[PDB]
Design a protein around this ligand. Structure first.
Ligand code: ZZZ
Length: 310
């Protein structure tokens, strides 16, 4: 064993939990780098670190005129970190920071690397209807999500899984355990390095609300995968009845359903939607059905799709 000085760079409840476990294991978290508020909620990793008197720093920022801000780097170097743990970072972290610690930097990534390198990997897993998923913890190198693996765990992906369900069922609870296990291996001097194969590598970038717009010119199954692969964040959407509607809780189980109800005209779609007591029936460009159970209105109100027209 060895108790280590660790810099934590991340966010969210996931980051908070990794932070708590590292401390429970006897490591010193020398600092936390997280996201700002927005709005006016503070990040829970930052709030937890602040409670404990651990240095907390908020970006981004991160960069200006090519290089890493001299300020952020300064704050980092004072900490004397021996390892960086990245439980949910976002932007490229300059190699002056990534490569500074004796033990380097390890990163949590919610896909089976080399598949779905880049941001929003859980979205892209489901958008493509992958039948298996999981997470990787990997050693940062100078590429984007190309570094050798430390460990990887797989799980089955179910036909109606969403980003949120797959995360809460597996990638969150097992991912936290996995990061903890990784730090233990590093502390013991027993951490593996498993180079990523070239075969099957794919890359996608961040999925912001704007690029979650539905393309209706696809089969029902692909549209279902698009909706669930953006559910709940950032939320797949379209224009209908003169507003922006976001669709959640899709299924391809349309057993016994008939397309009778109140039309929902959707510009660009192969057929109108139909609001039924079961929810919103939608058609793909193959005239096959999918069913959306919930709709978020442009003003943020969540409703049952069956209640759209009251
Ligand atoms: N140097 C480096 N920075 C990273 C990644 C990486 O692979 N290398 N991936 C993301 C980690 O959060 C974003 N930041």
């Amino acid at each position: 064993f060895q108790s280590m000085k660790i810099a934590v760079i991340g966010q969210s409840l996931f980051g908070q939990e990794v932070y708590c476990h590292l401390r429970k294991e006897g490591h010193e978290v020398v600092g936390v780098f997280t996201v700002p508020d927005k709005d006016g909620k503070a990040d829970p990793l930052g709030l937890e670190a602040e409670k404990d008197g651990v240095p907390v720093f908020k970006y981004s920022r991160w960069r200006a005129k090519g290089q890493a801000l001299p300020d952020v780097v300064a704050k980092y170097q004072a900490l004397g970190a021996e390892l960086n743990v990245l439980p949910f970072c976002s932007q490229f972290i300059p190699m002056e920071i990534i490569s500074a610690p004796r033990h380097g930097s390890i990163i949590y990534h919610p896909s089976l690397l080399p598949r779905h390198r880049g941001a929003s990997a859980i979205n892209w897993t489901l958008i493509h209807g992958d039948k298996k998923g999981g997470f990787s913890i990997f050693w940062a190198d100078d590429g984007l999500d190309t570094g050798d693996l430390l460990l990887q765990k797989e799980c089955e992906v179910l036909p109606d899984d969403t980003v949120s369900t797959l995360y809460n069922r597996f990638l969150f609870p097992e991912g936290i355990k996995g990061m903890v296990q990784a730090v233990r291996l590093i502390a013991e001097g027993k951490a593996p390095r498993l180079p990523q194969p070239e075969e099957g590598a794919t890359y996608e970038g961040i999925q912001k609300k704007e690029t979650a717009k539905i393309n209706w010119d696809q089969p029902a199954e692909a549209i279902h995968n698009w909706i669930r692969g953006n559910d709940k964040v950032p939320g797949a959407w379209t224009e209908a009845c003169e507003q922006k509607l976001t669709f959640f809780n899709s299924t391809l189980n349309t057993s016994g359903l008939v397309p009778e109800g109140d039309a929902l005209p959707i510009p660009g779609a192969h057929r109108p939607g139909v609001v039924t007591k079961a929810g919103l029936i939608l058609f793909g460009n193959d005239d096959k059905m999918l069913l959306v159970k919930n709709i978020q209105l442009e003003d943020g109100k969540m409703i049952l799709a069956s209640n759209f027209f009251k």
